[PDB]
């Protein structure tokens, strides 16, 4: 290739063509509350579709402690990638640990790591009328 890395090789016996590719995919991020409160973590594989995560990690040849972070009931799919080790919630809070793409994570309540959509702000509405005004009376 342009990086002087060989990618395709011809078998000297069968004259077929084989593609060699790196056995290390892209980035892995670890989300931790801190090792002063607990010892569980969440794992984010970014730019990886979580349907086929086990192919990208080769979890068959890892430790059994690495297989419980490969699939389960705690699988979430965000625009960043696939997040394993956290529970999805529907309420929105202020951002604590920024995962990305609008998704934040925190350590809520026995405590567990939760992932949610960040809250932009408080919701308010003021009515527009063409013949009324609001004037302060105190300060």
Partner 1 sequence: SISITTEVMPVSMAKTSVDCNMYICGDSTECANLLLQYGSFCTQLNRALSGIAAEQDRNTREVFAQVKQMYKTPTLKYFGGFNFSQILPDPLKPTKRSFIEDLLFNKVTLADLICAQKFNGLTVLPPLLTDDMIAAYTAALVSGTATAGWTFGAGAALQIPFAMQMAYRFNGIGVTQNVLYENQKQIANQFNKAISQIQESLTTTSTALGKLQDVVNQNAQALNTLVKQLSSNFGAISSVLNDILSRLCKVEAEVQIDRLITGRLQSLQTYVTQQLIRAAEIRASANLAATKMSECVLGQSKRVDFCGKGYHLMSFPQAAPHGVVFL
Partner 2 sequence: YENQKQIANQFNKAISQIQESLTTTSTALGKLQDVVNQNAQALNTLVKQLSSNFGAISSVLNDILSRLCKVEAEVQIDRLITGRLQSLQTYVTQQLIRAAEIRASANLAATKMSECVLGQSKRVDFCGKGYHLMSFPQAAPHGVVFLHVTYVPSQERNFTTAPAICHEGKAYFPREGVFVFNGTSWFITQRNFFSPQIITTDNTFVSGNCDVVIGIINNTVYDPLQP
Positions that interact with partner 2 (CB under 8 A): 130-139
Closer to ligand NAG at the Cβ: 5 or 13? 13
CB of 137 to partner 2, least distance (A): 4
Closer to ligand NAG at the Cβ: 24 or 130? 130
Burial string for 26-55 (b: 16+ CB within 10 Å, else e) reads: eeeeebebeeeeeeeebbbbbebebeebee
Residue 6 touches which member of partner 2, ligand NAG, partner 1, none, C-beta under 5-8 Å by kind: partner 1
CB of 127 to partner 2, least distance (A): 10
Closer to partner 2 at the Cβ: 22 or 136? 136
Residues that bind partner 1 (CB under 8 A): 1-6, 21-27, 46-47, 79-80, 95, 98, 100-102, 118, 120-136
Regarding 125 and contact with ligand NAG (CB under 6 A), the answer is no
CB atoms within 10 A of CB 71: 13
Please, which residues have CB within 8 angstroms of residue 30's CB and are 6 or more apart in sequence? 41, 42, 43, 44
3-state SS of 39-102 is CCCEEEEECCCHHHHHHHHCHHHCCHHHHCCCCCCCEEECCCEEEECCEECCCCCCCCEEEECC
CB of 112 to ligand NAG, least distance (A): 25
* DSSP three-state, residue 104: strand
**Of these, 8, 35, 91, 130, which contacts ligand NAG (CB under 6 A)?**
130
């Amino acid at each position: 290739d342009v990086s002087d890395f060989t990618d395709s090789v011809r078998d000297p016996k069968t004259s077929e063509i084989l593609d060699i590719s790196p056995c290390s995919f892209g980035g892995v991020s670890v989300i931790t509350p801190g090792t002063n409160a607990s010892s569980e973590v969440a794992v984010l594989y970014q730019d990886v579709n979580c349907t086929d995560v086990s192919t990208a990690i080769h979890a068959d040849q890892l430790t059994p402690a690495w297989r419980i972070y490969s699939t389960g009931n705690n699988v979430f799919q965000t625009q960043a990638g696939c997040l394993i080790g956290a529970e999805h919630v529907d309420t929105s809070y202020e951002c604590d640990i920024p995962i990305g793409a609008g998704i934040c994570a925190s350590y809520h309540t026995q405590k567990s790591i939760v992932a949610y959509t960040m809250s932009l702000g408080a919701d308010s509405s003021i009515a527009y009328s063409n013949n009324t005004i609001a004037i302060p009376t105190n300060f």
